[PDB]
Design a protein around this ligand. Structure first.
Ligand code: HEM
Ligand SMILES: OC[C@@H]1O[C@@H](OCCCCCC2CCCCC2)[C@@H](O)[C@@H](O)[C@H]1O[C@@H]1O[C@H](CO)[C@@H](O)[C@H](O)[C@@H]1O
Ligand SMILES: OC[C@@H]1O[C@@H](OCCCCCC2CCCCC2)[C@@H](O)[C@@H](O)[C@H]1O[C@@H]1O[C@H](CO)[C@@H](O)[C@H](O)[C@@H]1O
Length: 461
């Protein structure tokens, strides 16, 4: 068939853009899609307005796509960012780069942020950050052990951290009398990150022509952002000019031939695609911990066994902490920072008892895979163990917080590194206890963030 989908009644003009609201709206989209999947099975499809797409929610369909993968996979078109690059005449980046052009840049970095021997080498820099972060932590801690604006806090950490990795400089976000251009560049990011959203459901080209107030905002946001990044990536190059092998950036710029104009673009989308996501999972892991004392116990122990005394962690030991590394796992399978990624076919393909029309929009509901009762017994349970007892099962195509395919998360490594170190110093110097036992809903706003302030307390030892 072709119209056997099935899916939710196709109600006039809107499509399912009805229930989607008469159920919570966009911020609860992941939930309702989760139900349809429960309903209409492994695969179906819906149309929000004139937007049509088919949802994939199974380990089968996932391999049944991984294998049929193309050389240049591609997700939805982020036209607004593209619009800006063309307008202002700037390069593109792995988020929007395409086909050959993409594959080129990917390879160059891809081969350096996903190679342990290299990533692990970030070792100290991260700790330097982790250091000042905790040093500031107890200061923010009141006496109940709580932090006001935790997310905001963890975001500062992840920002400051990744920029030490990218521009090789501290921005001073972790302590007063050190902000200013720190936050203008931050706002620029925050403004830009909300505005572009509006030129997606609306004709960016139309906007541009009318020079709409919104077009101008987004423009300026990015105009600024590129002005904050450029010099940072010019100092890093002028500094490791005659020192081959040293700077991973300067090495790409020279023996992978890429223009400063391309590096600027690539780095920036790296930062953008980094920070919040990172911070976001860090917070959900903490949260899950605060709700499972036993598992936090078995975790503390493993952090004392491998680190007797309050000594500083180091990339490596992680090899000796299978419960922690898998705590971060299960955490992501129960509370994913990212619910789903999207793909575009560029050749008709086979899925379900169906075959897709080529050029179709696919929404890989990588979330739902977490409750696949056939791969996860008691899906609604935080069990860092299932990922350890080597008697288990779990086909890699059931847990994919970083996306499947070769156009999957390029950060994954360095992300997990950071989410492994910080989490050591945390569970080290602090106990993580629940401030309360009342409901906390996940809300899609780019990445599942929580409905309210996280009810978790940081009591010292
Ligand atoms: C807990 C942290 C993170 C999660 C869960 C995560 C999530 C993902 C996911 C699910 C994708 C989509 C994959 C697909 O197309 O199927 C993605 C793409 C990507 N991520 Fe992350 N990410 C995180 C951190 C990082 C970090 C720290 C960086 C930056 C160095 C990074 C940068 C990117 C980039 C540049 C892409 C686009 C790659 C391309 O298609 O060319 N990520 N990420
Ligand atoms: O930019 C990330 C997300 O990507 C955006 O684009 C993809 C979704 C397309 C529908 C979005 C629009 C629907 C109605 C008009 C406004 C948003 C949306 O998810 C958007 O809500 C957006 O959420 C945005 O991220 C912010 C958090 O830093 C939100 O506070 C902000 O409102 C912004 O919308
Ligand atoms: O969260 C917003 C979107 O929600 C879904 O619908 C998006 C369009 C929203 C439909 C329009 C609604 C808002 C205004 C018009 C009426 C209702 C999916 O596309 C989903 O993949 C999602 O698409 C978004 O894509 C962005 C790409 O950067 C990311 O924020 C993220 O992938 C997100 O899912």
């Amino acid at each position: 068939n072709v119209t056997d989908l099935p899916g939710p009644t196709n109600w006039p003009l809107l499509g399912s853009l009805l229930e989607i609201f008469w159920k919570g709206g966009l911020k609860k989209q992941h939930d309702t899609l989760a139900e349809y999947h429960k309903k209409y099975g492994q695969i179906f499809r819906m149309k929000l307005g004139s937007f049509d797409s088919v949802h994939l929610g199974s380990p089968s369909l996932l391999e049944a796509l991984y294998r049929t993968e193309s050389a240049h996979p591609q997700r939805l078109e982020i036209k607004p960012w593209k619009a800006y690059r063309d307008h202002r005449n700037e390069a593109y980046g792995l988020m929007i780069l395409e086909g050959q052009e993409w594959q080129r840049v990917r390879s160059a970095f891809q081969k350096k942020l996903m190679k342990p021997v290299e990533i692990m080498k970030l070792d100290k820099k991260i700790n330097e950050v982790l250091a000042d972060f905790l040093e500031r932590m107890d200061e923010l801690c009141d006496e109940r052990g709580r932090i006001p604006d935790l997310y905001s806090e963890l975001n500062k950490w992840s920002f400051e951290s990744i920029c030490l990795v990218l521009y090789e400089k501290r921005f001073g976000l972790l302590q007063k009398e050190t902000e200013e251009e720190a936050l203008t560049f931050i706002t620029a990011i925050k403004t830009m990150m909300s505005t572009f959203g509006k030129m997606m459901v609306t004709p960016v080209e139309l906007h541009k022509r009318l020079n709409t107030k919104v077009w101008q905002a987004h423009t300026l946001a990015w105009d600024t952002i590129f002005k904050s990044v450029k010099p940072c990536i010019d100092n890093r190059l002028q500094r490791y000019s005659q020192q081959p092998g040293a700077d991973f950036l300067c090495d790409i710029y020279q023996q992978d031939h890429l223009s400063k104009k391309e590096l600027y673009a690539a780095v920036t989308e790296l930062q953008l695609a980094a920070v919040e996501t990172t911070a976001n999972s860090l917070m959900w892991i903490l949260y899950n911990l605060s709700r499972n004392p036993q598992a936090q116990r078995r975790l503390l122990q493993e952090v004392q066994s491998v680190l007797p005394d309050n000594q500083t962690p180091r990339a490596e030991d992680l090899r000796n902490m299978p419960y922690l590394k898998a705590c971060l796992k299960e955490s992501m399978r129960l509370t994913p920072s990212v619910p789903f990624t999207t793909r575009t076919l560029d050749k008709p393909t086979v899925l379900g008892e169906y075959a897709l029309p080529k050029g179709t929009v696919l929404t890989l509901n990588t979330q739902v895979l977490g409750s696949s009762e056939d791969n996860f017994e008691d899906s609604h349970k935080f069990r860092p163990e299932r990922w350890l007892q080597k008697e288990k099962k779990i086909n890699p195509f059931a847990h994919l917080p970083f996306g499947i395919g070769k156009r999957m998360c390029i950060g994954r490594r360095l992300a997990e590194l950071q989410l492994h170190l910080a989490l050591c110093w945390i569970i080290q110097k602090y106990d993580i206890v629940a401030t309360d036992n009342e409901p906390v809903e996940m809300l899609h706003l780019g990445i599942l963030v929580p409905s309210r302030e996280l009810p978790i307390a940081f009591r010292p030892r």
